[PDB]
Protein backbone atom coordinates (compact mmCIF):
# COMPACT_ATOMS: atom_id res chain seq x y z
CA UNK A 1 0.00 0.00 0.00
CA UNK A 2 0.31 3.65 0.65
CA UNK A 3 2.93 6.32 -0.95
CA UNK A 4 5.83 8.54 -0.30
CA UNK A 5 5.62 11.20 2.91
CA UNK A 6 7.47 13.99 4.12
CA UNK A 7 7.55 15.92 7.39
CA UNK A 8 7.59 18.72 8.60
CA UNK A 9 5.44 20.70 5.84
CA UNK A 10 6.42 24.07 7.38
CA UNK A 11 9.65 24.78 9.60
CA UNK A 12 10.83 28.35 10.80
CA UNK A 13 13.90 28.11 12.63
CA UNK A 14 16.22 30.30 14.07
CA UNK A 15 20.11 30.32 12.31
CA UNK A 16 22.65 27.73 13.61
CA UNK A 17 20.59 25.50 14.65
CA UNK A 18 20.36 21.25 13.47
CA UNK A 19 17.46 20.26 10.99
CA UNK A 20 16.43 16.94 9.33
CA UNK A 21 13.89 16.32 6.93
CA UNK A 22 12.12 13.00 6.65
CA UNK A 23 11.28 11.25 4.27
CA UNK A 24 9.73 7.72 4.33
CA UNK A 25 8.18 5.50 0.99
CA UNK A 26 6.30 2.25 1.47
CA UNK A 27 6.60 1.20 -2.38
CA UNK A 28 10.22 -0.49 -1.59
CA UNK A 29 11.61 1.87 -4.07
CA UNK A 30 15.68 1.38 -4.19
CA UNK A 31 16.35 5.25 -5.65
CA UNK A 32 15.24 8.44 -3.30
CA UNK A 33 16.09 11.62 -3.79
CA UNK A 34 16.03 15.47 -2.68
CA UNK A 35 15.54 18.28 -4.45
CA UNK A 36 15.69 21.55 -3.92
CA UNK A 37 14.09 24.93 -5.32
CA UNK A 38 14.31 28.75 -4.00
CA UNK A 39 12.30 31.43 -4.87
CA UNK A 40 13.70 32.07 -8.37
CA UNK A 41 14.60 29.33 -9.81
CA UNK A 42 14.18 25.37 -10.96
CA UNK A 43 14.07 21.83 -8.81
CA UNK A 44 17.33 20.93 -8.56
CA UNK A 45 19.15 17.85 -7.27
CA UNK A 46 20.89 17.83 -3.77
CA UNK A 47 21.62 14.34 -2.69
CA UNK A 48 20.41 10.71 -4.17
CA UNK A 49 20.80 6.91 -3.08
CA UNK A 50 20.79 3.95 -5.41
CA UNK A 51 19.95 2.14 -2.29
CA UNK A 52 20.74 1.27 1.41
CA UNK A 53 24.67 2.37 1.52
CA UNK A 54 24.79 4.89 -1.13
CA UNK A 55 24.52 8.43 -0.88
CA UNK A 56 25.32 10.49 -3.70
CA UNK A 57 25.77 14.51 -3.79
CA UNK A 58 23.39 15.85 -7.12
CA UNK A 59 25.00 19.39 -5.87
CA UNK A 60 28.60 19.68 -4.55
CA UNK A 61 28.21 22.79 -2.54
CA UNK A 62 25.27 21.60 -0.63
CA UNK A 63 25.89 21.38 3.10
CA UNK A 64 23.15 19.36 3.50
CA UNK A 65 23.88 15.14 4.60
CA UNK A 66 21.67 12.18 4.15
CA UNK A 67 21.85 8.92 5.13
CA UNK A 68 20.35 5.74 3.61
CA UNK A 69 20.04 2.57 5.96
CA UNK A 70 17.00 1.24 5.24
CA UNK A 71 15.18 1.58 1.94
CA UNK A 72 12.29 3.06 3.44
CA UNK A 73 14.41 6.39 4.74
CA UNK A 74 15.91 8.85 3.56
CA UNK A 75 16.90 11.90 6.00
CA UNK A 76 18.15 14.95 5.10
CA UNK A 77 20.39 16.75 7.78
CA UNK A 78 21.55 20.47 8.19
CA UNK A 79 23.99 20.67 10.71
CA UNK A 80 23.78 24.14 10.89
CA UNK A 81 20.75 26.29 9.36
CA UNK A 82 21.82 30.07 8.04
CA UNK A 83 19.29 31.97 6.09
CA UNK A 84 20.53 30.71 2.72
CA UNK A 85 19.07 27.43 3.32
CA UNK A 86 15.32 29.22 3.53
CA UNK A 87 13.95 27.17 0.44
CA UNK A 88 11.66 23.90 -0.51
CA UNK A 89 12.46 21.08 0.25
CA UNK A 90 11.30 17.52 -2.13
CA UNK A 91 11.94 14.01 -1.52
CA UNK A 92 10.93 11.31 -4.23
CA UNK A 93 12.07 7.77 -4.85
CA UNK A 94 11.44 6.09 -8.64
CA UNK A 95 11.71 2.53 -9.82
CA UNK A 96 11.66 1.18 -13.73
CA UNK A 97 8.55 0.62 -15.16
CA UNK A 98 8.71 0.01 -18.95
CA UNK A 99 12.23 0.87 -19.43
CA UNK A 100 11.66 4.34 -17.74
CA UNK A 101 12.26 5.77 -14.43
CA UNK A 102 9.31 7.05 -13.41
CA UNK A 103 9.32 9.55 -9.73
CA UNK A 104 6.76 9.99 -7.25
CA UNK A 105 7.04 12.83 -4.79
CA UNK A 106 6.79 14.11 -1.10
CA UNK A 107 4.45 17.24 -1.28
CA UNK A 108 7.53 19.11 0.60
CA UNK A 109 9.02 21.02 3.51
CA UNK A 110 8.69 24.66 3.09
CA UNK A 111 11.99 25.77 5.27
CA UNK A 112 12.68 29.35 6.70
CA UNK A 113 15.78 29.76 8.38
CA UNK A 114 15.75 33.37 10.19
CA UNK A 115 18.89 35.20 11.69
CA UNK A 116 16.13 37.10 13.64
CA UNK A 117 13.63 35.20 15.50
CA UNK A 118 11.78 38.37 16.36
CA UNK A 119 10.63 39.05 12.57
CA UNK A 120 8.00 36.29 14.10
CA UNK A 121 4.47 37.12 13.71
CA UNK A 122 0.83 35.31 14.13
CA UNK A 123 -1.72 36.46 11.64
CA UNK A 124 -4.50 38.36 12.92
CA UNK A 125 -8.10 36.71 11.59
CA UNK A 126 -11.30 39.67 10.78
CA UNK A 127 -14.38 38.11 9.42
CA UNK A 128 -15.98 41.24 7.28
CA UNK A 129 -20.20 40.24 6.82
CA UNK A 130 -22.20 40.40 3.75
CA UNK A 131 -22.75 43.68 2.79
CA UNK A 132 -26.68 43.92 2.57
CA UNK A 133 -26.31 45.77 -1.11
CA UNK A 134 -24.91 42.56 -1.93
CA UNK A 135 -27.94 40.31 -0.52
CA UNK A 136 -30.92 42.79 -1.73
CA UNK A 137 -29.56 42.73 -5.28
CA UNK A 138 -27.97 39.61 -5.87
CA UNK A 139 -29.91 36.89 -3.53
CA UNK A 140 -26.40 36.08 -2.13
CA UNK A 141 -24.12 36.53 0.80
CA UNK A 142 -20.29 37.16 0.64
CA UNK A 143 -17.98 36.96 3.80
CA UNK A 144 -14.95 38.04 3.34
CA UNK A 145 -11.74 36.55 6.17
CA UNK A 146 -8.74 38.89 6.51
CA UNK A 147 -5.86 36.92 7.85
CA UNK A 148 -2.69 39.91 8.28
CA UNK A 149 0.29 40.31 10.01
CA UNK A 150 1.70 37.39 9.75
CA UNK A 151 5.28 36.27 8.73
CA UNK A 152 6.79 33.59 7.21
CA UNK A 153 3.75 32.58 4.37
CA UNK A 154 3.51 29.21 6.73
CA UNK A 155 -0.56 29.13 6.69
CA UNK A 156 -3.70 27.22 5.98
CA UNK A 157 -6.75 29.22 5.90
CA UNK A 158 -10.03 27.05 5.90
CA UNK A 159 -13.76 28.36 6.58
CA UNK A 160 -16.05 26.16 8.98
CA UNK A 161 -19.91 26.61 8.94
CA UNK A 162 -21.98 24.82 11.68
CA UNK A 163 -18.48 23.06 12.54
CA UNK A 164 -17.93 21.06 9.50
CA UNK A 165 -15.50 22.71 6.56
CA UNK A 166 -16.61 23.67 3.30
CA UNK A 167 -14.95 24.18 0.40
CA UNK A 168 -17.99 25.11 -1.75
CA UNK A 169 -18.26 28.88 -2.65
CA UNK A 170 -15.00 29.61 -1.52
CA UNK A 171 -11.71 31.30 -3.16
CA UNK A 172 -8.44 31.91 -0.90
CA UNK A 173 -6.25 34.26 -2.58
CA UNK A 174 -3.29 31.83 -4.42
CA UNK A 175 -0.64 33.95 -3.41
CA UNK A 176 -0.27 36.44 -0.02
CA UNK A 177 0.37 40.41 -0.58
CA UNK A 178 3.05 42.11 1.19
CA UNK A 179 2.03 44.68 3.76
CA UNK A 180 5.38 46.59 3.50
CA UNK A 181 7.06 45.70 -0.06
CA UNK A 182 9.78 47.43 0.74
CA UNK A 183 11.28 44.97 2.88
CA UNK A 184 12.13 41.42 1.73
CA UNK A 185 10.83 40.85 5.17
CA UNK A 186 7.75 42.54 4.81
CA UNK A 187 4.98 41.18 6.77
CA UNK A 188 2.15 39.35 4.97
CA UNK A 189 -1.61 39.54 4.20
CA UNK A 190 -4.52 36.75 3.18
CA UNK A 191 -7.75 36.93 2.13
CA UNK A 192 -10.53 34.35 1.37
CA UNK A 193 -14.33 34.66 0.22
CA UNK A 194 -17.11 32.41 1.28
CA UNK A 195 -20.65 32.93 -1.06
CA UNK A 196 -23.45 31.87 0.51
CA UNK A 197 -27.26 32.29 -0.86
CA UNK A 198 -28.34 35.08 1.40
CA UNK A 199 -31.01 33.14 3.23
CA UNK A 200 -28.64 30.57 4.47
CA UNK A 201 -26.76 33.85 5.53
CA UNK A 202 -29.88 35.47 7.43
CA UNK A 203 -30.73 32.34 9.27
CA UNK A 204 -29.47 33.17 12.86
CA UNK A 205 -28.66 29.36 13.52
CA UNK A 206 -25.41 29.70 11.26
CA UNK A 207 -22.27 30.33 12.87
CA UNK A 208 -19.08 30.82 9.97
CA UNK A 209 -16.00 30.93 11.56
CA UNK A 210 -12.47 31.54 9.42
CA UNK A 211 -9.99 29.70 10.84
CA UNK A 212 -5.90 30.01 10.11
CA UNK A 213 -3.55 27.65 11.25
CA UNK A 214 -0.28 29.33 11.58
CA UNK A 215 3.06 27.35 11.91
CA UNK A 216 5.75 29.33 14.26
CA UNK A 217 7.71 29.06 17.00
CA UNK A 218 8.16 25.78 18.77
CA UNK A 219 7.27 25.61 23.22
CA UNK A 220 11.51 24.71 23.29
CA UNK A 221 12.10 28.24 20.67
CA UNK A 222 14.19 31.12 22.88
CA UNK A 223 11.86 33.96 23.56
CA UNK A 224 12.54 37.39 25.12
CA UNK A 225 10.08 39.98 23.58
CA UNK A 226 7.90 42.19 25.16
CA UNK A 227 4.89 40.52 23.48
CA UNK A 228 3.54 36.82 23.42
CA UNK A 229 5.30 34.18 21.74
CA UNK A 230 4.72 33.43 18.15
CA UNK A 231 4.29 29.89 18.36
CA UNK A 232 2.09 27.62 15.84
CA UNK A 233 -1.11 28.57 16.37
CA UNK A 234 -4.44 28.59 15.26
CA UNK A 235 -6.31 32.23 14.86
CA UNK A 236 -9.90 32.45 14.32
CA UNK A 237 -12.99 35.30 13.39
CA UNK A 238 -16.01 34.15 13.50
CA UNK A 239 -19.99 35.58 12.80
CA UNK A 240 -23.51 34.78 12.81
CA UNK A 241 -26.16 34.31 10.04
CA UNK A 242 -28.39 37.76 11.00
CA UNK A 243 -31.90 38.28 9.20
CA UNK A 244 -31.91 41.99 8.96
CA UNK B 1 20.71 20.18 -19.05
CA UNK B 2 19.50 24.05 -19.28
CA UNK B 3 15.78 23.17 -19.63
CA UNK B 4 13.38 26.49 -20.98
CA UNK B 5 9.95 26.43 -20.82
CA UNK B 6 7.42 28.72 -22.09
CA UNK B 7 5.28 30.85 -21.87
CA UNK B 8 6.68 31.73 -17.72
CA UNK B 9 2.91 32.08 -17.36
CA UNK B 10 -0.71 31.05 -19.13
CA UNK B 11 -4.00 32.48 -18.18
CA UNK B 12 -6.71 31.18 -20.32
CA UNK B 13 -10.84 30.57 -20.38
CA UNK B 14 -11.74 27.27 -20.38
CA UNK B 15 -13.15 25.49 -23.81
CA UNK B 16 -9.72 26.79 -25.66
CA UNK B 17 -6.84 25.31 -26.79
CA UNK B 18 -3.06 25.90 -26.00
CA UNK B 19 0.08 24.55 -26.52
CA UNK B 20 3.55 24.34 -23.99
CA UNK B 21 6.83 24.47 -24.80
CA UNK B 22 9.79 22.90 -22.88
CA UNK B 23 13.48 23.48 -24.81
CA UNK B 24 17.17 22.53 -24.04
CA UNK B 25 20.63 22.95 -26.29
CA UNK B 26 21.29 19.43 -24.73
CA UNK B 27 19.84 16.13 -26.66
CA UNK B 28 17.79 13.83 -24.17
CA UNK B 29 17.61 9.85 -23.89
CA UNK B 30 13.95 10.69 -22.59
CA UNK B 31 12.14 13.07 -21.20
CA UNK B 32 8.72 13.75 -18.65
CA UNK B 33 6.06 16.01 -18.08
CA UNK B 34 4.89 16.53 -14.20
CA UNK B 35 1.88 18.55 -13.06
CA UNK B 36 2.23 20.05 -9.62
CA UNK B 37 -0.66 21.52 -7.52
CA UNK B 38 0.01 24.41 -4.59
CA UNK B 39 1.19 22.67 -1.77
CA UNK B 40 1.92 18.93 -3.26
CA UNK B 41 4.77 16.94 -4.64
CA UNK B 42 5.18 16.97 -8.79
CA UNK B 43 2.80 14.33 -10.21
CA UNK B 44 4.06 12.41 -13.57
CA UNK B 45 1.45 13.07 -16.31
CA UNK B 46 4.35 10.83 -19.21
CA UNK B 47 7.25 9.72 -20.26
CA UNK B 48 8.51 10.20 -24.00
CA UNK B 49 11.64 8.43 -25.35
CA UNK B 50 11.67 8.55 -29.21
CA UNK B 51 12.71 11.36 -31.34
CA UNK B 52 9.15 12.70 -33.18
CA UNK B 53 6.77 10.58 -31.04
CA UNK B 54 2.99 11.57 -30.35
CA UNK B 55 1.08 10.61 -26.77
CA UNK B 56 -2.45 11.37 -26.41
CA UNK B 57 -3.54 11.14 -22.66
CA UNK B 58 -6.78 12.15 -22.87
CA UNK B 59 -6.76 15.95 -24.02
CA UNK B 60 -3.41 16.08 -23.53
CA UNK B 61 -0.77 15.69 -26.15
CA UNK B 62 2.71 15.48 -25.53
CA UNK B 63 5.53 15.31 -28.60
CA UNK B 64 9.09 14.65 -28.38
CA UNK B 65 11.14 16.48 -31.51
CA UNK B 66 13.05 14.57 -33.51
CA UNK B 67 15.94 15.20 -32.51
CA UNK B 68 15.13 14.77 -28.93
CA UNK B 69 15.96 18.53 -27.66
CA UNK B 70 12.30 19.96 -26.93
CA UNK B 71 8.83 18.13 -26.32
CA UNK B 72 5.50 20.35 -26.28
CA UNK B 73 2.61 19.62 -24.21
CA UNK B 74 -0.96 20.68 -26.15
CA UNK B 75 -4.66 20.87 -24.27
CA UNK B 76 -7.79 20.62 -25.84
CA UNK B 77 -10.49 21.97 -24.60
CA UNK B 78 -8.90 23.29 -21.17
CA UNK B 79 -10.96 23.29 -18.09
CA UNK B 80 -10.88 25.62 -14.97
CA UNK B 81 -9.49 21.50 -13.42
CA UNK B 82 -5.96 22.07 -16.03
CA UNK B 83 -5.03 24.51 -13.46
CA UNK B 84 -1.00 24.26 -12.47
CA UNK B 85 2.69 24.16 -12.89
CA UNK B 86 3.29 22.33 -15.90
CA UNK B 87 6.86 21.18 -15.31
CA UNK B 88 8.93 19.98 -18.53
CA UNK B 89 12.09 17.23 -16.95
CA UNK B 90 14.96 15.91 -19.56
CA UNK B 91 17.29 12.83 -18.92
CA UNK B 92 20.72 12.77 -20.10
CA UNK B 93 21.98 8.82 -19.62
CA UNK B 94 25.12 10.67 -20.31
CA UNK B 95 25.14 12.07 -17.11
CA UNK B 96 24.21 9.31 -14.20
CA UNK B 97 21.01 7.58 -13.23
CA UNK B 98 18.29 9.23 -12.12
CA UNK B 99 19.61 12.44 -13.20
CA UNK B 100 16.83 14.55 -14.41
CA UNK B 101 17.02 18.18 -15.32
CA UNK B 102 13.72 20.26 -14.30
CA UNK B 103 12.24 23.27 -16.18
CA UNK B 104 10.99 25.79 -13.97
CA UNK B 105 7.75 25.48 -15.84
CA UNK B 106 4.45 26.93 -17.34
CA UNK B 107 2.02 28.37 -14.55
CA UNK B 108 -0.95 27.50 -16.50
CA UNK B 109 -4.53 28.97 -14.81
CA UNK B 110 -8.03 28.15 -16.54
CA UNK B 111 -11.10 30.72 -16.06
CA UNK B 112 -14.53 29.42 -15.52
CA UNK B 113 -16.38 31.27 -18.06
CA UNK B 114 -19.00 33.92 -16.28
CA UNK B 115 -23.02 33.70 -17.32
CA UNK B 116 -24.09 36.48 -16.39
CA UNK B 117 -21.67 39.02 -14.99
CA UNK B 118 -23.18 41.62 -12.70
CA UNK B 119 -20.09 44.18 -11.73
CA UNK B 120 -20.39 46.09 -8.51
CA UNK B 121 -17.75 47.11 -5.89
CA UNK B 122 -19.55 46.77 -2.28
CA UNK B 123 -18.68 47.35 1.44
CA UNK B 124 -18.19 44.74 4.06
CA UNK B 125 -18.07 45.41 7.99
CA UNK B 126 -16.05 43.89 10.52
CA UNK B 127 -18.03 41.44 12.19
CA UNK B 128 -16.91 42.61 15.48
CA UNK B 129 -16.65 46.57 16.26
CA UNK B 130 -14.19 47.97 14.31
CA UNK B 131 -13.54 51.15 12.37
CA UNK B 132 -12.12 48.78 9.68
CA UNK B 133 -14.01 47.66 6.43
CA UNK B 134 -13.03 45.77 3.09
CA UNK B 135 -14.35 46.65 -0.15
CA UNK B 136 -14.99 43.44 -2.49
CA UNK B 137 -15.56 44.17 -6.41
CA UNK B 138 -17.56 41.18 -7.47
CA UNK B 139 -19.33 39.52 -10.42
CA UNK B 140 -17.18 40.54 -13.47
CA UNK B 141 -16.86 38.73 -16.59
CA UNK B 142 -13.00 36.70 -17.42
CA UNK B 143 -11.58 39.99 -19.29
CA UNK B 144 -12.13 42.97 -16.67
CA UNK B 145 -8.42 43.02 -15.29
CA UNK B 146 -8.47 44.10 -11.43
CA UNK B 147 -5.64 46.46 -11.58
CA UNK B 148 -2.88 46.22 -8.70
CA UNK B 149 -2.65 48.97 -5.54
CA UNK B 150 0.69 50.95 -6.96
CA UNK B 151 -0.70 53.26 -3.96
CA UNK B 152 1.61 52.26 -0.06
CA UNK B 153 -1.07 52.46 1.76
CA UNK B 154 -3.82 50.15 -0.20
CA UNK B 155 -3.59 46.58 -0.72
CA UNK B 156 -5.59 45.17 -3.63
CA UNK B 157 -5.74 41.39 -4.11
CA UNK B 158 -5.69 39.63 -7.64
CA UNK B 159 -9.09 37.94 -9.46
CA UNK B 160 -10.14 34.82 -7.58
CA UNK B 161 -13.06 32.54 -8.68
CA UNK B 162 -15.56 30.95 -6.71
CA UNK B 163 -17.81 28.19 -7.60
CA UNK B 164 -21.62 27.67 -5.65
CA UNK B 165 -21.91 24.23 -7.05
CA UNK B 166 -25.73 23.79 -5.48
CA UNK B 167 -26.16 26.60 -8.17
CA UNK B 168 -24.44 26.04 -10.73
CA UNK B 169 -23.31 29.50 -10.54
CA UNK B 170 -19.49 30.85 -10.13
CA UNK B 171 -18.40 34.53 -9.35
CA UNK B 172 -15.32 36.77 -9.49
CA UNK B 173 -13.83 38.40 -6.90
CA UNK B 174 -11.06 41.01 -6.03
CA UNK B 175 -10.58 42.00 -2.52
CA UNK B 176 -9.21 45.92 -1.50
CA UNK B 177 -8.50 47.19 2.02
CA UNK B 178 -6.60 50.05 3.74
CA UNK B 179 -5.72 51.00 7.03
CA UNK B 180 -7.91 54.48 6.77
CA UNK B 181 -8.25 57.37 6.50
CA UNK B 182 -8.77 59.06 2.64
CA UNK B 183 -9.26 55.27 1.52
CA UNK B 184 -12.80 55.05 -0.34
CA UNK B 185 -14.52 51.52 -1.89
CA UNK B 186 -15.13 54.44 -4.31
CA UNK B 187 -11.88 54.83 -5.45
CA UNK B 188 -10.17 51.80 -4.64
CA UNK B 189 -10.93 49.36 -7.97
CA UNK B 190 -10.73 52.51 -10.52
CA UNK B 191 -8.71 52.47 -13.80
Known amino acids: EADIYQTPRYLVIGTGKKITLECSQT?????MYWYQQDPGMELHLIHY???????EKGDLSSESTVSRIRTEHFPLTLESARPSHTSQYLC?????????????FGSGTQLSVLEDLNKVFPPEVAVFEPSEAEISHTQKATLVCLATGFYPDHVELSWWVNGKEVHSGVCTDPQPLKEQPALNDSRYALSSRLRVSATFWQDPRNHFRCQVQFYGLSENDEWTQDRAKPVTQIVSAEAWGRAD | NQVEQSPQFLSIQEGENLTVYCNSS?????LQWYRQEPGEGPVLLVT?????EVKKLKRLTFQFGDARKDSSLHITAAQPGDTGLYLC?????????????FGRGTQLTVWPDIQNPDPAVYQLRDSKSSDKSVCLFTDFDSQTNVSQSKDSDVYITDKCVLDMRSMDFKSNSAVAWSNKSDFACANAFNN
Open chain 2, 26 to 30: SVFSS
Open chain 1, 49 to 55: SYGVNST
Open chain 1, 92 to 104: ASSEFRDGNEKLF
Open chain 2, 48 to 52: VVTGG
Open chain 2, 89 to 101: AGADRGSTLGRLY
Open chain 1, 27 to 31: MGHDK
